[PDB]
Point group: D2
Chain length 383, copies 4
């Protein structure tokens, strides 16, 4: 009955995230100019530099330094005092074009037959634990780093620096949340404020306002800047890389994962598109009330348009025998490369925004919408 | 009852893996000279270069170019013909030292009290699906890319190139394997051989000898180099990065994951050490026969030595009420930073070997050993 | 009366020249699209990479990788066998925009008033030692490396590699050439041919056909691949950088030099335009017969249109008192930034061609033409 | 009789010089540990990075980041406010080992026979225009940038930034100096001070105290920060590269040059050692009173110990027929690779100090000493 589950999240000022933002910042710029572009951009970030590389084959014309400097700038690093500075950092580029060998298998004569960008498996997930049908732990962790960033930008706590990470562990009894045992919040700061003050301030401004007072009890344990000092952060304190936040980007470790990153790749890359499409049916199934929680999983083969595997897991919480529930899935949605792109209209520059604070949970994203639910209901005991 | 599950693996010639190998190749070298070194090494690999960076604080003296060139060389790329060459590629370095701010929370006066290298959560897993208590899908996928590499090196198929990826999906009925529906195998090759021949050869030499003939039926579907052409590969066709094989490195997507990569980090980094220790108790629990399959999860807080969370999931397959099963865990093993390192003796250069073909399944690894099982048995109905 | 003077040259396959070529290759491409572009391109070349950086502010849209790969390709390195490969090498870019602080001083309201791109001094030179009014030592050294490159491309000596350097020292008595004391010729080669053969072959194919048989006597000493082995070359054997061939680029050490490189910069950069204009008047003066040999020198001040200094040196060989000869100079030519560009029509992509084998001596270059001579004659005892 | 000659210099804060300093800073460190090390270190410096590369073969163990960060730190860039920061900039490394092919020709069995590091020609120079037998123009220009640097460090003009360049043109009549026509002084500054103030301040603190009041007349023209604004400088405003200050490093353009840079290379490199040895005999000749001014020139052939060419030019100012003056040269000094190093005791870390403000003119340098003069006198009309 009782058990503990822990999830974590990172601020937009976290090295790894900086990468993602940059990566997806480039794609957006590119896509704005050419929707059918093929972008596979990987970014490396350290002490005084930013490396934007990979393979890009587009007709668009973009400025990497500008997109980069501007992207970091917005993140927050604008002075050597914080360790990194959009204005004075180095911006390197090693961007080649996509291999034709791969391309022949992706873009074929007939657009519909067009194949998967690569082989691989993706996991979709949905749960009635919350309104947005997302697990609770990841939702609150995200809220924590997000708050910290907002209290920093609005000038509430001017001594806060971009870099920050958050961890929370919930108490789960009878399969439901009963509270929160431990809370972790690490945030970069200036040489001007003291630990205690900082700690005491983080509680009032960042934790207390975000964590439901009900789940907080005299038992909860708070871990704030444990090493006792976090003045050095960002790429200086930790190397940032693209696609190294795979889990916080998705469901916090509650659901499963195939190993494919999101940022830097255009929709023809199943790692991102098939993933989104998977959250789409999973969420839609639960909204449709066909199950309380279900994990979906598709797998593909490079240059091949038709999915190599599909499986729905409802953990017994289903309301219609999986059978019809699985035959309904391939019945209603098109998981073929050039079916999901139209299904969710992925040919637009809407990904940068997705690079920090979770790819799921934001109802305004095309894959968060639940329109097929009611119709997915009709296919089984409408009433 | 019936459902499909897919996993995947990559050859030691895959860009991402090249990174990991390099990353862990540097640490080993360093560790050989200094076991208590603090290594956080991230590698970026593309068309004609290799970028080794991150933060390293050691008293050891190593040669990055030599370790790198040699590491790639062994992988296989030794001619421009294959796209990359250990002898003629560029070797770049951006390696700083570890932030003292982090260090004060890690290495404290008392070695026992020494804290976790970072915050985060890790997932351990074990299953009686196989002798090594590893899931089957990931085990066979690894075997496929591994075979390909060996048939290449031994000269059986001299036209094979280092770069290769493998995907397999099993049929699961009644919770057990009944067969394999689809098989995917992509391998780089020379301009000298044709697709058909290649395909036909891959079956005889790499697939047929590795996949159990029982699970192969007239239904199984084989996908071999689908785009129809894979002559261009390695960093030229795809950017390689450290820690982007998170899932194939562990359990193939069968179990869960927290988001911590392994390669490039010394044991004081819970991402690698708490992870290993988690596979250790999970495996040891199943071996101890206390459960058919169980997932373990620990989470930590930077600078803090005592785990912030622990949870054992046996999916009902447990044989002793979880209660005593969870109280036994913290009873037998020490998950504190400086407890797992001694527990598994992680202060040695034994990681490079772990950078390709799974971190689990190799019984000779200290975390694969099951010595505590029988003793973990004594603590519950010995007999 | 008697004395020895030595000059040297380098093949288009030399690391430093590779840089130059690349640098000026980028400019041309840019200029083709925008003649008034401001290009300050510096290239770094090593083992498996090429670094193109600096500051560029243009409205043009160019592809660095393509321009670079193609430029190296043409030079000759196309296989790992030779140490570098246009197809498999890395291409990096760190190009920012020109500082507006400099720009306000360069481009002012009135185009004529437009100022010098930087401060500095430049040396022009001319001599009746040869038809093209160039010194002899530098002329023959260029010819040597140029021949080696041609005998390599035409397939005469297929085992020759791109990298090569040439050195010649002439005997000067009575102020004229009497012969050549020592000849140096170093060229990269394949593991297939032996030293002796190579040496013997270099004489017949490269040295004997280029050096006048009259100046070659039993005294002359030949130095061919002295270390006894030159199989390793190019960026692998030596780091290439832009603007490190300052002297072979001009007059071989016979005349003076101020320190400004040529490649990578647009004409608004006095280092290149004022230099060219200087060879222009010096050559024109000797052609006009006003002197047998004269060195010119101008100096500028950033943001300032009017030259800070001008001086003509005729080494006594003048035929009209220097006085009128110097008053004639500023009388006939316009050395103001926006006067020399029109004077020589420098807003065109004509520089790559100038990046190897000398910037002077090629009569088809705009600064090699002598049209003002006859008119420079009228201004002094026409007849 | 009358004519104008211009020279220039650059502060230790100039991008190019930053490179040199870095380059020679690495050598010294290495040499300190191993005098017979072979170092060919080329540095590239831009906006937020520093690239140290080339080929180094030593038994020494050094820290590039530390040597670099510290070297830049001392120069002065320590805040993003000035555009570059030693603490937060990137430090990259691409250092391979020296090609054995070259080595066999350099270090042979017999140490005496040991050969020249490369082919090439070098120019030495001396003049009685000044006590240190250096030309005047380059001496004063160096003094100008050197003053600016000192008035910045001592806090006299706290708003001064590291980057600065200086230009001076002298009036030469009857072959002697009569005065100075134009003065150029460009220095980077803070957003806090205005142009007029700055200009007025630069005259009092930097120009007036350094330029002889005799040579300054109502005619002299002063050019101070002409573009009207120099707030942006350093690698941000201009790319820094090693060996691009060839001329200011030596004689300001008064004497000739062969094209060989000094910084980053050990003494076995004739570009630096033969160069120094050339200033040594030229200076010593004039000190010996054998000529008022003389230019020396040697040339070498890779792997070859014996110089390929030697020539002394006294411009008629000699006092003993050149003949005996040239036979005296090879009589007194040893220009063989392994003769000059002992001659000047070059196996020591004494080069960093030589990377800013001229390689000649500092009488405490081993090549600035004149001990052979009196003995060079005995060999010709002692009395
Ligand atoms: C703990 S660091 C990685 C370990 C590090 N590379 C090392 O050398 O041990 C990972 C993240 O922790 C956070 N961090 C950095 N310094 C910290 C500190 N002093 N206290 C708490 N968190 C810190 C940052 O957001 C950083 O991305
Ligand atoms: C499909 S690629 C990544 C997509 C690519 N960056 C793009 O621009 O679309 C990922 C992996 O697939 C494999 N691969 C590369 N070229 C391939 C081809 N032509 N056919 C099959 N697999 C290929 C390699 O092992 C490579 O690391
Ligand atoms: C002699 S190397 C400079 C010294 C080198 N950086 C080192 O590590 O000693 C410079 C040039 O000499 C030429 N070179 C390289 N290897 C050579 C060899 N084995 N014999 C003759 N010339 C060679 C190339 O053109 C190369 O760019
Ligand atoms: C004029 S810049 C070279 C041209 C530049 N690459 C461009 O993009 O036009 C070279 C040097 O001039 C100096 N400098 C830079 N900005 C300056 C300014 N605004 N006024 C005067 N000197 C300046 C610095 O010492 C710098 O290294
Ligand atoms: K890292
Ligand atoms: K990639
Ligand atoms: K070099
Ligand atoms: K520059
Ligand atoms: Mg990371
Ligand atoms: Mg993938
Ligand atoms: Mg990858
Ligand atoms: Mg982590
Ligand atoms: Mg060079
Ligand atoms: Mg200059
Ligand atoms: Mg320069
Ligand atoms: Mg040279």
């Amino acid at each position: 009955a009782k058990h503990l589950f822990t999830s974590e999240s990172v601020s937009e000022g976290h090295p790894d995230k900086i990468a993602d933002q940059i990566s997806d910042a480039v794609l957006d710029a590119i896509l704005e100019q050419d929707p059918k572009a093929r972008v596979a951009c990987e970014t490396y970030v350290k002490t005084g530099m930013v490396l934007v590389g990979g393979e890009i084959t587009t007709s668009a014309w973009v400025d990497i330094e500008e997109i980069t400097r501007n992207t970091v700038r917005e993140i927050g690093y604008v002075h050597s005092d914080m360790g990194f500075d959009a204005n004075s950092c180095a911006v390197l580029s090693a961007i080649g074009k996509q291999s034709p060998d791969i391309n022949q298998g992706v873009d074929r004569a007939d657009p519909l037959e067009q194949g998967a960008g690569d082989q691989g498996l993706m996991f979709g997930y949905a749960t009635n634990e919350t309104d947005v049908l997302m697990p609770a732990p990841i939702t609150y962790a995200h809220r924590l780093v997000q708050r910290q960033a907002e209290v920093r930008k609005n000038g509430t706590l001017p001594w806060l620096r971009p870099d920050a990470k958050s961890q929370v562990t919930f108490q789960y009894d009878d399969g439901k949340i009963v509270g929160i045992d431990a809370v972790v919040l690490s945030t970069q700061h200036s040489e001007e404020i003291d630990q205690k003050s900082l700690q005491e301030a983080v509680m009032e401004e960042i934790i207390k306002p975000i964590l439901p007072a009900e789940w907080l009890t005299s038992a909860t344990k708070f871990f704030i800047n444990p090493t006792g000092r976090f003045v050095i952060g960002g790429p200086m304190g930790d190397c940032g890389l693209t696609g190294r936040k795979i889990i916080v980007d998705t469901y916090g470790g509650m659901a499963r994962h195939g190993g494919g990153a999101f940022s830097g790749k255009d929709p023809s890359k199943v790692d991102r598109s098939a993933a989104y499409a998977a959250r789409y049916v999973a969420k839609n199934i639960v909204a449709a009330g066909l199950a309380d929680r279900c994990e979906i999983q598709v797998s593909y083969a490079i240059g091949v348009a038709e999915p190599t595997s599909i499986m729905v897991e409802t953990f017994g919480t289903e309301k219609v025998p999986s059978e019809q529930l699985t035959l309904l899935v391939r019945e209603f949605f098109d998981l073929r490369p050039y079916g999901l792109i139209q299904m969710l209209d992925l040919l637009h520059p809407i990904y940068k925004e997705t690079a920090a604070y979770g790819h799921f949970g934001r109802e305004h994203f095309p894959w968060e919408k639940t329109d097929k639910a009611q119709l997915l209901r009709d296919a089984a005991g409408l009433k």
